[PDB]
Every structure is written in structure tokens, then in C-alpha cells.
């Protein structure tokens, strides 16, 4: 979850730090997921942004 492996030494205490959010993470050394793709996340389960349109005729704005 967001946590990707760095070190490719030791195979016992390799150093783990946090991948950012809108990155691939599938992988334990890749992240870097593709470019203006799925900004959420893009290697689980169709995780797809949603443009958020202005149409809902019971929002605050509407």
C-alpha cells in the first residue's frame, strides 16, 4: 500500500520507504506508474480517476 522496497543489498533489512500515491506500486522496486494515466492507482484493480462534472441538480453549486 503505497510502500515500495529500495535496497537491492541485504535480503534480510533491504530499506523500504513510502511510494507516492500516483505511482504504479505493483512491483516491489518499479513504481513510476504511466504518465496521465490513472492518477489514484493504476496496478490493482482499474482504480480510474472520474472526471467530476457540474451536473448533479442537488449540489451546493446546482
Known sequence: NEVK???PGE???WLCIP????E?????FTC?????????????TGCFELPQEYI????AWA
Do not use: F
Request: hydrophobic share 30%; aromatic share 16%; proline share 6%.
Open 11 to 13: 535480503v534480510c533489512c
Open 56 to 59: 448533479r441538480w442537488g449540489d
Open 32 to 44: 513510476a506508474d504511466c504518465g496521465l494515466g490513472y492518477w489514484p492507482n493504476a496496478s490493482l
Open 24 to 28: 504504479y506500486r505493483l512491483d516491489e
Open 5 to 7: 522496497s529500495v535496497q
Open 19 to 22: 511510494c507516492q500515491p500516483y
